[PDB]
Design a protein around this ligand. Structure first.
Ligand code: NA
Length: 347
């Protein structure tokens, strides 16, 4: 049976990474279920490099900054003639802004982030029910549907997102995630009485190197050494075109430090199930994703060590404080060194 736990483990022990399944489903026991995506992205084998990377500073070189600004302005169709530029320096970081005060379109570029948005895009992605953070509930998951909006197909929308990442010169995995922000995306914080829900597609693309995306884990400064964030390039579009473009921190590969064979995900899942069985008293669990990612660890002088990890994303149905039986589905995760299987402490 395709849904037996031992058969699922065996299916995750493929000698060729490209032959692993993309989804697995099985019951472990009456308090632990697996209904999970398997993500090995564009990895070509289990032999993976570790290395050193340098942070890409988007704003330190004014020429490079303005070059990024023009690509973002093309994407959101910003009227550059009527825009007002502003600039600030904060703790050695340069911040550049371009605002169209008539339309409320804006571009903001800092050392490790860039955001271009229309007024409608801003409200769809950041003033409504949709949220981009995995923690604490993975609210985005309810918008990951096959609905086709009426202004363009999901296939045509994906072609525009792929073309935009190429224009921005950001290498991303072939797999992206699509969120459909239709009427279910309730507008919570309108700015004016004229603001309404606007049908929008939101793609998450994943900047990568050697076919493996940088970590999609929540911030965990104890583990990474810095205020890390989820690696997703967010591209949204409505009937007017691209409406929101958020670029996460990017990195430039400097050198390979070591290369080795990583564990098959069977080894990770069996170890993670053994761990999760011990946390049974804290609530029922459902494993939702096993993913091969590159984690960054702060080193020195804007350099980071880049090493492969296996991330297990799961939900736990936890009792709400002060409640006798009311529970909340919490989005949690575990991280393993992909070479050794060392489990990292996630507090
Ligand atoms: Na609608």
């Amino acid at each position: 049976d395709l849904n037996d736990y031992e058969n699922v483990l065996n299916s995750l022990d493929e000698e060729q990474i490209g032959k692993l399944p993309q989804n697995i489903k099985c019951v472990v026991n009456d308090k632990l279920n697996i209904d999970s995506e398997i993500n090995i992205w564009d990895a070509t084998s289990y032999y993976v490099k570790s290395g050193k990377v340098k942070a890409i500073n988007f704003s330190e070189n004014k020429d490079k900054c303005y070059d990024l600004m023009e690509k973002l302005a093309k994407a959101i169709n910003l009227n550059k003639d009527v825009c007002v530029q502003s600039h600030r320096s904060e703790n050695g970081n340069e911040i550049y802004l371009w605002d169209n005060n008539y339309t409320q379109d804006s571009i903001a570029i800092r050392n490790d982030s860039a955001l271009a948005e229309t007024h409608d895009g801003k409200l769809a992605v950041s003033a409504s029910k949709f949220g981009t953070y995995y923690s604490p509930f993975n609210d985005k998951d309810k918008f990951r549907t096959d609905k086709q909006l009426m202004f363009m197909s999901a296939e045509e929308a994906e072609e525009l997102a792929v073309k935009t990442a190429k224009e921005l010169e950001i290498n991303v995995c072939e797999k992206n995630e699509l969120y459909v922000l239709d009427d279910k995306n309730t507008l919570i914080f309108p700015e004016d009485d004229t603001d309404k829900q606007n049908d929008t597609y939101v793609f998450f693309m994943f900047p990568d190197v050697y076919g493996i995306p940088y970590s999609r884990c929540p911030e965990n400064e104890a583990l990474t050494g810095y205020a890390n964030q989820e690696n997703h390039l967010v591209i949204a579009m409505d009937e007017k075109g691209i409406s929101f473009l958020d670029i996460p921190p990017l990195y430039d590969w400097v050198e390979t430090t070591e290369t080795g064979e990583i564990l098959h995900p069977s080894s990770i899942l069996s170890k993670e199930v053994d761990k999760l069985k011990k946390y049974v008293t804290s609530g029922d669990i459902e494993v939702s994703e096993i993913s091969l990612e590159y984690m960054l660890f702060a080193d020195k002088n804007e350099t980071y060590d880049i090493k492969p990890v296996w991330v297990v994303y799961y939900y736990q149905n936890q009792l709400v404080t002060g409640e006798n039986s009311y529970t909340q589905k919490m989005a949690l995760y575990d991280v393993y060194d992909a070479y050794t299987g060392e489990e990292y402490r996630i507090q």
